[PDB]
Amino acid sequence: FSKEESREFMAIFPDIVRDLTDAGRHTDIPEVTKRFAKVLQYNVPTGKKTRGLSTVIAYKMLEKPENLTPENVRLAGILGWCVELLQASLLIMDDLMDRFLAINDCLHVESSLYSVLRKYFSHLPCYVPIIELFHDVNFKTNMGQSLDALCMKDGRPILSQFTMKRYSSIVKYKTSYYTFQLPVSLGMYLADMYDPEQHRQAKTILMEIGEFAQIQDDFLDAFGDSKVGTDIKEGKCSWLAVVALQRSNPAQRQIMEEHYGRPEPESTQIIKNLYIELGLPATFAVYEEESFNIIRTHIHQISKGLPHDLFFKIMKKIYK
Amino acid sequence: SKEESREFMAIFPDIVRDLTDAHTDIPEVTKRFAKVLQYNVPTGKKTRGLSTVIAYKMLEKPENLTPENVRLAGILGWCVELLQASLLIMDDLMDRSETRRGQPCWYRQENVGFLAINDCLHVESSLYSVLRKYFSHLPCYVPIIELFHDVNFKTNMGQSLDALCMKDGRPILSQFTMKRYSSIVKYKTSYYTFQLPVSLGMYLADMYDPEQHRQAKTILMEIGEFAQIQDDFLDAFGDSKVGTDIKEGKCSWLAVVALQRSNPAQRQIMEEHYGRPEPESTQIIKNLYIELGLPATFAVYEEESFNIIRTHIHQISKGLPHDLFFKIMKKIYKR
Numbered sequence: 108f109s110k111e112e113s114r115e116f117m118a119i120f121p122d123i124v125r126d127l128t129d130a131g132r133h134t135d136i137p138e139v140t141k142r143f144a145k146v147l148q149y150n151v152p153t154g155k156k157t158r159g160l161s162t163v164i165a166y167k168m169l170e171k172p173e174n175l176t177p178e179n180v181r182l183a184g185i186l187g188w189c190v191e192l193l194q195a196s197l198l199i200m201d202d203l204m205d206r207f208l209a210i211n212d213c214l215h216v217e218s219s220l221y222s223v224l225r226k227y228f229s230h231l232p233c234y235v236p237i238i239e240l241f242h243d244v245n246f247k248t249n250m251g252q253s254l255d256a257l258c259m260k261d262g263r264p265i266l267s268q269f270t271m272k273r274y275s276s277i278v279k280y281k282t283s284y285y286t287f288q289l290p291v292s293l294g295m296y297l298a299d300m301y302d303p304e305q306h307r308q309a310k311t312i313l314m315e316i317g318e319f320a321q322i323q324d325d326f327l328d329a330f331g332d333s334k335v336g337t338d339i340k341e342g343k344c345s346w347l348a349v350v351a352l353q354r355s356n357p358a359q360r361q362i363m364e365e366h367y368g369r370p371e372p373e374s375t376q377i378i379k380n381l382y383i384e385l386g387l388p389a390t391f392a393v394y395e396e397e398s399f400n401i402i403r404t405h406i407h408q409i410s411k412g413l414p415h416d417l418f419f420k421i422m423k424k425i426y427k
Numbered sequence: 428s429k430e431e432s433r434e435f436m437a438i439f440p441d442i443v444r445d446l447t448d449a450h451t452d453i454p455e456v457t458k459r460f461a462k463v464l465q466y467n468v469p470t471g472k473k474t475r476g477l478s479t480v481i482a483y484k485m486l487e488k489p490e491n492l493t494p495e496n497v498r499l500a501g502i503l504g505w506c507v508e509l510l511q512a513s514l515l516i517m518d519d520l521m522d523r524s525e526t527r528r529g530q531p532c533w534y535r536q537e538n539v540g541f542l543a544i545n546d547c548l549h550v551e552s553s554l555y556s557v558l559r560k561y562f563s564h565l566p567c568y569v570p571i572i573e574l575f576h577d578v579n580f581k582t583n584m585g586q587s588l589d590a591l592c593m594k595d596g597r598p599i600l601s602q603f604t605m606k607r608y609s610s611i612v613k614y615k616t617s618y619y620t621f622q623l624p625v626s627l628g629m630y631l632a633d634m635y636d637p638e639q640h641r642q643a644k645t646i647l648m649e650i651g652e653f654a655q656i657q658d659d660f661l662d663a664f665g666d667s668k669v670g671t672d673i674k675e676g677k678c679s680w681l682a683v684v685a686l687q688r689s690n691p692a693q694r695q696i697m698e699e700h701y702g703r704p705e706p707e708s709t710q711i712i713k714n715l716y717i718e719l720g721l722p723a724t725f726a727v728y729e730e731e732s733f734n735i736i737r738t739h740i741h742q743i744s745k746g747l748p749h750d751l752f753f754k755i756m757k758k759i760y761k762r
């Protein structure tokens with residue numbers, strides 16, 4: 108992202124906080140409104156805002172050059188901040204259901220994005236498609252979180268649940284819809300692109316990129332140079348665990364049953380040793396090359412009047 | 428009414444099918460979501476959902492009250508019940524409560540716990556899918572979506588304000604003012620319980636005049652304040668649900684008025700014993716409420732508030748049926 112794109116995007120955030128904390132309204136509840144400003148300030152605008160900035164970039168690469176006014180690019184930035192409010196609610200729910208934050212802050216922050224949408228977009232033709240997209244993405248993300256939870260019982264991973272079909276569904280519902288589809292579909296709607304066939308062609312490619320993104324992340328959790336990866340300790344339905352179970356003989360499966368999802372550092376090393384024995388690094392290398400080629404082909408084939416350069420830019424960001 | 432109750436209850440199974448059986452790649456999680464809805468949504472009194480139907484029936488032109496429109500009002504009532512179910516799932520986890528409507532709290536069910544947070548957000552998100560299915564073609568669609576999102580935001584402000592009356596699980600009695608109490612009740616309870624059903628009835632009746640919505644709101648916030656004060660009173664003075672407001676350190680009307688009326692010695696009993704787990708501390712607080720004459724104070728408030736609200740309803744500007752607001756008063760005051 109350019110300095111100009113980043114600075115213009117960041118310039119919106121203080122307005123969003125003022126909008127949501129009723130600045131100029133003279134509220135009857137100033138204590139809790141001031142607290143909510145801190146919830147937003149402490150949790151929403153920090154670090155990389157990749158999903159929010161991707162919303163702006165998607166809009167800039169989908170819209171007609173003539174319509175790329177400072178006003179329309181600022182609307183794209185506001186949609187980007189609504190994606191970041193959703194991201195912040197999800198990260199808050201993560202901080203809560205593993206560990207100042209109150210349990211209802213995740214609900215509150217999620218609800219706040221709809222107030223921002225009403226303020227800035229309610230008079231535009233894209234309003235209803237955009238709110239329905241956020242509604243649908245919220246519901247599907249919750250389904251993905253529940254499907255992930257159905258892989259654990261009484262603090263132990265259920266290895267019979269670790270199928271590639273279930274893994275692919277968790278990644279799609281829990282992560283890819285809100286991370287990859289939502290920014291691009293928002294850019295399309297702000298560009299007055301409503302055609303279901305266009306959204307569908309974008310979705311096919313974005314779910315493929317999202318699957319590689321999570322598989323790469325799962326690979327690096329164990330095999331990256333260090334955050335220090337805890338997927339094995341936490342019993343996560345990781346791509347590595349799924350493929351290990353596909354590749355295991357009965358003796359190797361017994362090692363997974365005994366040592367996967369255990370707190371002891373030695374058990375994490377036993378699983379890493381089994382992943383090495385099973386050739387998961389070589390399997391990832393083959394998958395990275397094969398998935399790159401398939402996705403590149405699908406982007407070359409993209410039709411329905413969609414630009415290729417947006418999808419190539421997304422693919423190159425993930426694959427480097 | 429038997430007919431109203433049965434017609435309303437008949438809609439629930441269709442809504443569960445709409446939300447779980449219309450994602451064919453993930454049947455395990457749709458089957459689980461059906462159980463989340465079946466446990467948390469349809470077993471209560473459904474006062475708020477039924478009140479949405481009654482509000483609509485009293486706001487709509489009699490000649491437009493078709494079975495089809497009454498069913499739409501019922502679907503909106505179930506969306507209110509979905510919102511409430513999400514809120515109580517979350518509140519029960521936050522308050523670590525044992526039971527709700529005489530069932531174990533959802534978060535206490537095997538392998539839920541903090542996953543109740545995801546179930547809360549899921550149940551709330553689900554009502555917008557119901558709205559899209561049945562209302563997307565109607566002029567009331569966007570006002571209704573916006574009302575649900577705004578009431579969710581305001582209810583969260585109420586829940587967070589309630590939490591600013593506690594520090595590390597101990598009540599902050601300096602926070603227990605009638606001003607803060609009134610604000611908690613308005614935002615945490617009255618908006619979703621009283622404003623939302625009536626405003627939904629108004630929108631389905633194509634009544635969009637913000638001033639009609641404002642006048643309804645003034646009366647409904649007054650009725651909602653009495654409703655919560657009565658509930659607080661009965662938590663301590665009701666005849667056996669066994670009330671635990673004292674043990675929980677709740678910012679109750681009884682605690683607020685006790686602090687107004689207390690001499691320094693009585694204040695110290697509140698400081699020492701309010702929000703403690705020991706049964707004898709609850710007894711000490713109840714005994715202080717008796718010493719301070721809170722029963723007589725409630726009896727006077729019940730009489731005066733009834734008369735003041737009846738006066739305000741008589742003054743409601745034409746367009747709104749006084750009968751609707753009197754019917755709500757009669758439900759709450761039982762007269």
Ligand SMILES: CC(C)=CCC/C(C)=C/COP(=O)(O)OP(=O)(O)O
Binds near residue numbers: 513515517518524586
């Ligand atoms: C944003 C959220 C989660 C709002 C909760 C709304 C609500 C009605 C809580 C119950 O209040 P309470 O805990 O004072 O009373 P009860 O005794 O009914 O739990």
Ligand SMILES: [Mg+2]
Binds near residue numbers: 324328
């Ligand atoms: Mg990871």
Ligand SMILES: [Mg+2]
Binds near residue numbers: 518519522524
């Ligand atoms: Mg509670």
Ligand SMILES: [Mg+2]
Binds near residue numbers: 658659662
């Ligand atoms: Mg009560």
Ligand SMILES: [Mn+2]
Binds near residue numbers: 518521522589
């Ligand atoms: Mn509570």
